[PDB]
């Protein structure tokens, strides 16, 4: 089981040169509940973006270059990333864009958070054909004092 988890804003935008301009504690909490104990796979940029290991999860970084941090496992290719993950019920892929574009056709489940935030970014979630995916779960939330924007949690299963 290979899953992708991501927060998508308007036009599939998942990143810009800097931190997204929003504040979604509930989203990050969701991220945590659904990643905990499972191994996570990420590209180098996303690693650099987080700037610290995600605790309680085997952390795996894609990069053509040699590793620069020993608190985390570094891999040189996708098949290897998958090998580094071992025999686990479910693998979590956590970005960024280049890494999603590669793992999507190899994935059975998407954890998507939809934020109606008009934000311009050079990085996007891949285009997923709504015909290939069945939406099995959905929960919407209003913005509030702790969260800057509306967000919808969604879980998609490949038909």
């Amino acid at each position, epitope marked *: 089981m290979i899953s992708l988890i991501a927060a*998508l*804003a*308007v*036009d*599939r935008v998942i990143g810009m040169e800097n931190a997204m301009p929003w504040n979604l504690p509930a989203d990050l909490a969701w991220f945590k509940r659904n990643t905990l104990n499972k191994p996570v796979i990420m590209g180098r940029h996303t690693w650099e973006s987080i700037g610290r290991p995600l605790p309680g999860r085997k952390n795996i970084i894609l990069s053509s270059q040699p590793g620069t941090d020993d608190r985390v496992t570094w891999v040189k290719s996708v098949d290897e990333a998958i090998a580094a993950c071992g025999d686990v019920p479910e693998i979590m892929v956590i970005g960024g864009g280049r890494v999603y574009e590669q793992f999507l056709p190899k994935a059975q489940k998407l954890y998507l958070t*939809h*934020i*109606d935030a*008009e934000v311009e970014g050079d990085t996007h979630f891949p*285009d997923y054909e*709504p015909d290939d995916w069945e*939406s099995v779960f*959905s929960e*919407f939330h209003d*913005a509030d004092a702790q969260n800057s*924007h*509306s967000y*919808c949690f969604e879980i998609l299963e490949r038909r």
Partner: nanobody
Amino acid sequence: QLQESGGGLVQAGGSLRLSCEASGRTFSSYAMGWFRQAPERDFVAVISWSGSNTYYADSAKGRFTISRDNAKNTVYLQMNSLKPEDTAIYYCAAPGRPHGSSWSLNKKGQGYDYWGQGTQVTVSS
């Protein structure tokens, strides 16, 4: 899939609310837009999937209001200071892509794959 309701004849300066029911998909997941055609399809207004975002054409800014009622799978276009230049057929349109995926498209009147048959709006002097 999409049925436009409301729409008839109204005197100048008059109001009139348009209605559009959409069946066949999960309503709350998709934006909804409005177009109008005069004997070329001009984009009028779009409301995002969550309702929190709205974009109005210049011809529509200030006068009109687009809103949605998920419990009734309907978007509405309220129209308030009508004039003979607004007279045309009005269509509801929906993006084929769910959520905010086609949003900048939809605001530019593109990225719509579903249309209604339209409702007539006539404004007399």
